[PDB]
């Protein structure tokens, strides 16, 4: 049994109160106060629609993924990744696809910088979408579950779906459950063919083992996954560490 399975078994044993104290212990988070207030008032400029904008910005600012040309955003939700890419200098067009409907987020219309090069489409299940030519492929799909075998199935499904969209392009793909031996086998095959590396985002909660497969980097997948497993296990040991607070992104206004 993997270090990740031991972390998941422990996570599943926590009371709601313990789970609530654990999930944000020692993580990094952006202060969403101003954006939440503005969005409640129906403000359409400056504010990121979700925490997703700051999450993708973390990778982009470290050159792990460099969005350019035609950006495809799979599982765009409210649109955090799409509106962030819309303001990047090398980006020319952003297309977002999301399921929507009961239990899922709907795209939020915004007037942030570069809103005019974005098209968000709801009622779209990516598992039935044929692949499209694109210069950047983004995918944030992976629903958490108390069952690691459910999470493993969801991860393999995403990995099999994304491959036909990968054609020597920039990419950032969520890997919900990267520690199961079957997932590691797929990721290593994918890394040999398309390159890139798996990276833990410090904005991720301790309640998820999610890592992101990004195009610009190299490294040992097994070592990186085991490093995250040891980190998350170690975070059960000590009393709650309040999260490190950072400033949220200002997405500005205007067209391009």
Ligand X SMILES: C[S@@+](CC[C@H](N)C(=O)[O-])C[C@H]1O[C@@H](n2cnc3c(N)ncnc32)[C@H](O)[C@@H]1O
Distance (Å, whole) CA 29 – CA 26: 10
Please indicate whether residue 174 is annotated as part of the active site: yes
- 3 state DSSP class of 198: strand
- Residue 80 as a binder of ligand 5LP (CB under 6 A): the answer is no
Q: Helix 181-194 vs helix 221-237: angle between axes, to the nearest 10 degrees? A: 140
- The DSSP code for 163 is G
- Whole-angstrom CA distances from 250 to 10, 184, 206 are 38, 37, 26
Query: Residue 101: which of ligand 5LP, ligand X, none does it interact with, CB under 5 to 8 A by kind?
Result: ligand 5LP
Structure token pair of residue 52: 């997703």
Binding residue (CB under 6 A) for ligand 5LP from 36, 90, 104, 256: 104
Distance (Å, whole) CA 159 – CA 165: 11
- Residue 95 as a binder of ligand X (CB under 6 A): the answer is no
Q: Smallest distance, Å, CB 210 to ligand X?
A: 9
Please indicate whether residue 210 is annotated as part of the active site: yes
Active-site pick, 8, 135, 174, 248:
174
Query: Residue 106: which of ligand 5LP, ligand X, none does it interact with, CB under 5 to 8 A by kind?
Result: ligand 5LP
Where the chain is discontinuous (C–N > 2.5 Å), the residues before each break are: none
Question: Is 80 annotated for ligand binding?
Answer: yes
- 3 state DSSP class of 146: coil
Question: Is 50 annotated for ligand binding?
Answer: yes
Binding residue (CB under 6 A) for ligand 5LP from 4, 100, 114, 243: 100
Q: Mark 102-141 with x for binding to ligand X (rule: CB under 6 A) and - for no binding.
A: --xx------------------xxxx------------xx
Question: Is 212 annotated for ligand binding?
Answer: yes
Structure token pair of residue 15: 């009371």
Structure token pair of residue 184: 């590691």
- 3 state DSSP class of 30: strand
174 touches 141 (CB < 8 A): yes
54 touches 249 (CB < 8 A): yes
Active-site pick, 135, 140, 151, 248:
140
Give the residue with the Cβ less far from ligand X, 104 or 256. 104
Please indicate whether residue 163 is annotated as part of the active site: no
- Residue 105 as a binder of ligand 5LP (CB under 6 A): the answer is yes
Site for ligand 5LP, rule CB under 6 A: 100-106
Site for ligand X, rule CB under 6 A: 50, 52, 75-81, 98-99, 104-105, 124-127, 140-141
Residues designated as active site: 55, 140, 174, 210
Task: Write out the binding residues.
Answer: 50, 80-81, 98-99, 125-126, 141, 212
């Amino acid at each position: 049994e993997t270090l990740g399975e031991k972390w998941k078994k422990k996570l599943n044993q926590l009371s709601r109160k313990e789970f609530d104290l654990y999930k944000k212990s020692g993580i990094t988070e952006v202060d969403r106060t101003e954006a939440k207030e503005g969005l409640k008032r129906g403000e359409t400029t400056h504010h990121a629609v979700s925490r997703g904008s700051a999450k993708l910005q973390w990778f982009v600012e470290r050159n792990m993924v460099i969005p350019e040309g035609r950006v495809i955003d799979l599982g765009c939700g409210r649109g955090g990744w799409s509106y962030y890419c819309a303001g990047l200098k090398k980006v020319t067009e952003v297309r977002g696809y999301t399921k929507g409907g009961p239990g899922h987020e709907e795209p939020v219309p915004m007037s942030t910088y570069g809103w005019n090069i974005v098209k968000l489409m709801s009622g779209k299940d990516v598992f039935y979408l044929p692949p499209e030519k694109c210069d950047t492929l983004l995918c944030d799909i992976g629903e958490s579950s108390p069952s690691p075998t459910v999470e493993e199935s969801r991860t393999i499904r995403v990995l099999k779906m994304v491959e036909p969209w990968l054609k020597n392009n920039q990419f950032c793909i969520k890997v919900l459950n990267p520690y199961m031996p079957t997932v590691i086998e797929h990721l290593e095959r994918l890394q040999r063919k398309h390159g890139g590396m798996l990276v833990r985002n410090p904005l991720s909660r301790n309640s998820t083992h999610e890592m992101y497969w990004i195009s610009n980097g190299t490294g040992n997948i097994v070592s990186s996954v085991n490093m995250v497993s040891r980190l998350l296990l170690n975070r059960f040991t000590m009393t709650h560490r309040r999260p490190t607070i950072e400033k949220d992104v200002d997405l500005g206004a205007g067209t391009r």
